[PDB]
Design a protein around this ligand. Structure first.
Ligand SMILES: *[C@@H]1O[C@H](CO)[C@@H](O[C@@H]2O[C@H](CO)[C@@H](O[C@@H]3O[C@H](CO[C@H]4O[C@H](CO[C@H]5O[C@H](CO)[C@@H](O)[C@H](O)[C@@H]5O)[C@@H](O)[C@H](O[C@H]5O[C@H](CO)[C@@H](O)[C@H](O)[C@@H]5O[C@H]5O[C@H](CO)[C@@H](O)[C@H](O)[C@@H]5O)[C@@H]4O)[C@@H](O)[C@H](O[C@H]4O[C@H](CO)[C@@H](O)[C@H](O)[C@@H]4O[C@H]4O[C@H](CO)[C@@H](O)[C@H](O)[C@@H]4O[C@H]4O[C@H](CO)[C@@H](O)[C@H](O)[C@@H]4O)[C@@H]3O)[C@H](O)[C@H]2NC(C)=O)[C@H](O)[C@H]1NC(C)=O
Ligand SMILES: *[C@@H]1O[C@H](CO)[C@@H](O)[C@H](O)[C@H]1NC(C)=O
Lengths: 58, 202
């Protein structure tokens, strides 16, 4: 509806994506979580292994 | 801080190198080798993963403030002048883009710019396989500016030129990392004379 579009459009007013949150005020803390949907094949010929993950950062 | 960035980008022509009419642009280069990958003797090539860092001075990016350093991700990397550095003996090279572009840009108040990025390079190495399996090699990794001759860009090695990690986590199946060295030369081409720099891994 209208209120959704108004909230979305005005959200990035005067927002600089070049600067991290809390720049010069605090330390940006990021909470990480991983859900390994599948541990992919391990290659001995490369010292390489594949892993399919849902990577969540908050 | 956004005011500082907006002021810096105002009237800034990234097509022109710093000191375009005054003097050559001096660049200080550093390498951290995460891993010299396997040496593929069939195709006469070897893989190498590096953190490649370049430091130079841009008078246009001077700013007077109490912050004294702007630490930034890749967002502004395309907004300013960057050197034309490329690896001469690289059959195939790739940057890294997961999760975001693996690039870093730091700008000091005095105009010093540090630009770092992660690279994976499949560098050519013409192995002389005489004395195999007693053979030893010194594989190079060369780089220089693609367009700017020596009169416009000059590279320089720092004291801590090239650094290496443990070297036991490297992907060397056949060989053992013996040693390292760095060199600077001037290579004449049809375009001009270019300041080439090589890192030799033994
Ligand atoms: C023949 O045709 C081919 C194409 O078929 C053509 O090749 C193409 O060349 C172009 C360059 O001319 C090249 O485009 C650029 O790509 C850059 C990013 O990476 C893209 O490639 C990587 C890796 O690609 C390589 O992958 C393999 C090797 O590893 C191999 O296939 C090839 O070697 C290949 O090159 C890829 O991982 C990227 O994936 C995504 O992530 C990018 C992140 O930056 C994003 O841009 C992409 O859209 C893409 O994201 C979408 O897709 C992923 C999934 O794949 C999703 O997860 C995402 O959600 C998205 O949906 C890319 O494909 C890219 O940086 C360049 O972008 C810049 O272009 C100019 C630069 O000045 C600007 O106009 C742009 O705005 C943009 O620059 C901004 O962004 C950078 C990066 O942060 C900043 O540093 C800049 O400062 C600048 O920032 C500013 O603007 C933005 C808004 O635009 C703003 O938000 C910022 O705040 C800031 O203000 C460029 O797009 C293309 O990939 C390549 N295609 C190929 C090879 O497949 C040939 O040249 C043609 N032939 C000839 C000879 O001409
Ligand atoms: C790399 O070059 C610098 C300056 O040319 C030099 O100080 C340093 O010792 C060199 N690195 C070596 C020899 O490993």
């Amino acid at each position: 509806t209208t209120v959704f579009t108004r909230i979305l459009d005005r959200l990035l007013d005067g927002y600089d994506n070049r600067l991290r949150p809390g720049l010069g005020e605090r330390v940006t803390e990021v909470k990480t979580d991983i859900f390994v949907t599948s541990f992919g094949p391990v290659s001995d010929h490369d010292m390489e292994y594949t892993i399919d993950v849902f990577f969540r950062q908050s | 801080v956004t005011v500082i960035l907006n002021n810096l980008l105002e009237g800034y022509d990234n097509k022109l190198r710093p000191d375009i009419g005054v003097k050559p642009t001096l660049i200080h280069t550093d390498m951290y080798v995460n891993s010299i990958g396997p040496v593929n003797a069939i195709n006469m090539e070897y893989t190498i993963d590096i953190f490649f860092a370049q430091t130079w001075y841009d008078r246009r990016l001077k700013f007077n403030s109490t912050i004294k350093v702007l630490r930034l991700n890749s967002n502004m990397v395309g907004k300013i002048w960057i050197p034309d550095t490329f690896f001469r003996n690289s059959k195939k090279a790739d940057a890294h883009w997961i999760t975001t572009p693996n690039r870093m840009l730091r700008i000091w108040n005095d105009g010093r710019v540090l630009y770092t990025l992660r690279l994976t390079i499949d560098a050519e190495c013409q192995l002389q396989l005489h004395n195999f399996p007693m053979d030893e090699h010194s594989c190079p990794l060369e780089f220089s500016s693609y367009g700017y001759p020596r009169e416009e860009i000059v590279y320089q090695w720092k004291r801590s030129s090239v650094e290496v990690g443990d070297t036991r986590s490297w992907r060397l199946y056949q060989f053992s990392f013996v040693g390292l060295r760095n060199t600077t030369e001037v290579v004449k081409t049809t375009s001009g004379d270019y300041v080439v720099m090589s890192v030799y891994f033994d």
